[PDB]
Design a protein around this ligand. Structure first.
Ligand SMILES: [Mg+2]
Lengths: 140, 148, 85, 59, 91, 120, 82, 156
């Protein structure tokens, strides 16, 4: 054996330090550990697409929960906060509902005033002057 | 991964930005070989830019030890007692000058996973939601199906 | 909700053009302006090579119309400078 | 606001008892109303791990 | 369904919702506008002849000149002698 | 077999009803298209995967000025199901070399040559 | 007469635009609980797990213990926030 | 054009009368002047703001911390005025822009505390039966801002 491997101990511990919190022999035996440490790393990067998915689904379920307290549905709140050019995203709107429920009651009041201004413009077809909260601000 | 590695919350040391900004390095400690190719860039860092560095922040007290080592180390000690010992082994002069400026900018808190990207200590101003916000009160406190 | 923004003339994405993603995110507290964002330098350079392409392609048409407006006159006096002698 | 730490936490995650009269009502429109309230899906503090379900009493 | 639900003689039936009808219709209205704007050209085919031939020919010449300028790079004595610096010591 | 498709010239002869629905002029038509790809080149034949590379529409939702000439229009007629064609309207004129660095293409299809981010 | 929400439970919301039409000013002072809307203050393993399941409205499964593996995998010094 | 009262003759939603726009703008001037007097006299206490910093929106109060995932080419300690405030609220009023509040009205300050890197964060690719296995470890650079003050000015 001219040169055989003298540092094979440290190549095993590169993998086995990630497996210390496993079950069974996956935390000890190297042959069983690499098929799970690799699989624990692929799931770690495929769940960067699911954290952003499961946070937005959580924010939608926390805006839908709080908009129902004021009688609004979720598409009646997001759809009419856009129309008032109030570009708040789902993270803040779900964190306004928990920590500032007076401001969230004002955003539910505003998104329902614009909704009623959208119906009153739609039942009165033909040229009518616009609503007060329905006037867009133009940028040039 | 994140279930293997510890985690912490985003904090500062002593509310580092409220009153004044306190530089969080105390010491840098360079071991630099006099004869040795591994510390070729580390000798050029001490010759050129450690004097420009030791004037840019006079709170950091820098010790160049200059002993016969094979691997040159830099031992950054911080204000909360933490020690981050890193190696500058076979690095060019432009690669140690950013490695040391990275050591100056950061605080002594661990580089483990930070849970939330923010830290409010008074998160609520109008009063945090409980189930009895957004619920109207009945007359006399009468619960449903209660006659008197 | 981006089919409403397309009727107002805004971008369908609020992260497109407009005051939200083209103004500077920050400034110095004394009031000196920040150095411009790398995504604003990359967008303004990509908008210039679009406007350079509008200037280039419009002139290639207008110079290409005048060349045909001269070749259809040079065809014409060839018809009349042989009708003699 | 202005509560202590421990009574603020108790007030937010307290469980509430809802009455829901079921006379002449379809059982699926009562089930949608109950299973929102049983999950905690009507609270803005909702999480699937926080265990914030309420008590629904259908008569 | 006997074998492989979506292939073969007996497949499971798939049906068209209001989603799939409205998704094809709003793609059919982008298409009808496409046929409108392609129906009115600025030039006829005889006016456009050679109107960008001087720019197309110079475009290829700069690809052709980049192709026939492939050659090894210059080799400096200051790259060969800088490897002497690996044994640069202090005193 | 599945071949390429010759679309007849009748399809691209606009009716006078069509000039009222979309705001185009038959006399004095527009000069520059704004081509934007809105469908993928995957599950499309190779003669459409290459035309999209010829027009520069490799990225979806990225606009591209192309001339309104019957040779560019012959390439747009192949891949018209993949793209969205709109006219580049110019309220102010084409930008000078002083107004070159302050332009913006809006979602209406117009290229404003002075672009502040201040309201009216 | 008009109120976009029934201003009865949380706060009295009043919406307003400024004269430029560029900011929306919302005024919402907190509503108080009236005095007439209040009340005066009034002055074995088997059977024990059935006794707590009836007490806290959980199932029987969370009162049985866990092994030493799950007991010492638990972070006993967890990170605190706020 | 009269319909008798069945269940489907009328719509099920209540007929909401929208108030007259000549009396609403007069009422809007009363509400704006009420809140503006609360800014002059100092009726507010703690303010919070929603700031569109780097790519997202941070609900921001005073004396808090923000962690952004990019280098801000700043020195540690430099006070920074965060523009693009798009909602400012108090216990008794909130102001929310269309889509931003003016720079004349709000001034959100922020220091820079630390310019760290992230925790070493793995990118591993794998496909079964194909000998396809890649591993890559990236540390994205980060910065930490401490918001010092959310000032408000009576410009309404
Ligand atoms: Mg089968």
């Amino acid at each position: 054996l001219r040169n055989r491997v003298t540092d094979r101990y440290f190549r095993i511990q590169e993998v086995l330090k990630h497996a210390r919190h496993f079950r069974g022999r996956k935390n000890r035996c190297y042959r069983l550990a690499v098929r799970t440490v690799i699989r624990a790393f692929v799931k770690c990067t495929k769940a960067r697409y699911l954290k952003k998915k499961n946070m937005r689904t959580l924010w939608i379920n926390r805006i839908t929960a709080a908009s129902q307290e004021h009688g609004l549905k979720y598409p009646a709140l997001i759809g009419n906060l856009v129309k008032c050019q109030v570009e708040l995203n789902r993270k803040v709107l779900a964190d306004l509902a928990i920590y500032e429920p007076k401001t969230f009651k004002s955003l539910a009041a505003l998104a329902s005033r614009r909704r009623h201004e959208g119906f009153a413009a739609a039942l009165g077809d033909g040229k009518e002057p616009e609503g007060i909260f329905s006037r867009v601000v133009q940028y040039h | 991964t994140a279930r293997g590695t510890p985690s912490r919350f985003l904090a500062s040391v002593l509310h580092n930005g409220l009153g004044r900004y306190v530089q969080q390095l105390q010491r840098l400690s360079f071991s630099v070989s006099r004869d040795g190719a591994s510390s070729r860039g580390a000798r050029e860092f001490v010759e050129r830019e450690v004097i420009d560095f030791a004037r840019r922040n006079p709170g950091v007290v820098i010790y160049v030890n200059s002993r016969p080592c094979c691997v040159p180390r830099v031992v950054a000690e911080y204000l909360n007692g933490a020690v981050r010992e890193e190696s500058i082994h076979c690095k060019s002069v432009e690669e140690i000058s950013t490695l040391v400026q990275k050591l100056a900018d950061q605080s002594g808190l661990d580089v483990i996973r930070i849970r939330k990207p923010f830290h409010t200590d008074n998160p609520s101003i109008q009063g945090q939601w409980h189930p009895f916000t957004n619920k109207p009160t009945t007359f006399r406190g009468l619960r449903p199906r209660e006659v008197q | 909700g981006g089919q409403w923004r397309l009727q107002q003339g805004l971008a369908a994405n609020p992260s497109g053009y407009g005051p939200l993603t083209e103004l500077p995110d920050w400034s110095y507290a004394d009031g000196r302006p920040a150095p411009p964002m790398k995504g604003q330098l990359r967008r303004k350079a990509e908008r210039e090579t679009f406007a350079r392409r509008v200037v280039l392609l419009s002139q290639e048409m207008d110079a290409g119309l005048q060349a045909w407006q001269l070749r259809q006159q040079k065809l014409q006096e060839e018809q009349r400078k042989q009708e003699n002698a | 606001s202005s509560f202590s730490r421990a009574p603020q936490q108790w007030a937010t995650f307290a469980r509430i008892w809802y009455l829901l009269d079921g006379k002449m009502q379809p059982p699926g429109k009562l089930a949608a109303m109950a299973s929102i309230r049983l999950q905690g899906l009507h609270k803005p503090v909702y999480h699937a791990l926080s265990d914030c379900g309420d008590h629904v009493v259908i008569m | 369904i006997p074998g492989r639900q979506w292939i073969g003689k007996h497949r499971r039936p798939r049906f068209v919702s209001l989603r799939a009808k409205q998704n094809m219709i709003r793609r059919l209205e982008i298409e009808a506008e496409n046929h409108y704007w392609l129906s009115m050209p600025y030039m006829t085919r005889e006016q456009e002849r050679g109107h960008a031939a001087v720019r197309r020919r110079e475009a290829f010449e700069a690809i052709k000149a980049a192709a026939t300028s492939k050659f090894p790079p210059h080799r400096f004595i200051a790259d060969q002698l800088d490897h002497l610096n690996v044994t640069k010591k202090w005193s | 077999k599945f071949t390429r498709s010759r679309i007849p010239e009748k399809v691209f002869q606009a009716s006078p009803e069509d000039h009222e629905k979309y705001g185009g002029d038959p006399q004095n038509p527009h000069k520059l298209h704004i081509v934007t790809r809105i469908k993928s080149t995957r599950r499309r034949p190779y003669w459409e995967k290459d035309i999209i590379k010829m027009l520069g529409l490799e990225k979806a939702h990225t606009p591209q000025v192309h001339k309104n000439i019957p040779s560019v229009n012959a390439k747009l007629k192949v891949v018209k199901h993949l793209i969205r064609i709109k006219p580049l309207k110019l309220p102010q004129g084409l930008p000078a070399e002083e107004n070159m660095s302050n332009t913006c293409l809006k979602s209406t299809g117009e290229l404003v040559v002075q672009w502040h981010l201040k309201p009216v | 007469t008009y109120s976009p929400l029934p201003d009865d439970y949380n706060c009295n919301v009043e919406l307003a635009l400024t004269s430029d039409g560029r900011t929306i000013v919302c005024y919402h002072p907190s509503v108080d609980i009236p005095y007439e809307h209040t009340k005066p203050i009034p002055r074995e393993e088997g059977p024990m797990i059935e006794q707590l399941s009836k007490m806290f409205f959980t199932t029987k499964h969370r009162w049985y213990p866990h092994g030493r593996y799950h007991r010492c995998r638990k972070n006993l010094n967890p990170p605190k926030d706020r | 054009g009269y319909v008798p009262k069945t269940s489907l003759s009328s719509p099920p939603w209540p007929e909401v009368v929208l108030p007259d726009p000549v009396e609403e703008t007069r009422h809007h001037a009363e509400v704006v002047k009420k809140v503006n007097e609360m800014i002059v006299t100092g009726q507010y206490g703690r303010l919070f703001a929603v700031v569109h910093f780097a790519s997202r929106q941070w609900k921001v109060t005073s004396e808090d911390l923000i962690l952004i995932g990019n280098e801000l080419d700043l020195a540690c300690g430099e006070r920074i005025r965060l523009e693009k405030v798009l909602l400012v609220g108090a216990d008794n009023f909130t102001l929310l822009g269309k889509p931003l509040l003016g720079k004349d009205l709000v001034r959100v300050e922020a220091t820079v505390i630390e310019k760290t890197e992230s925790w070493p964060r793995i990118i591993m690719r794998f496909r079964k039966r194909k000998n396809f296995k890649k591993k890559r470890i990236v540390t994205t650079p980060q910065t930490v801002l401490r918001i010092n003050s959310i000032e408000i000015a009576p410009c309404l």
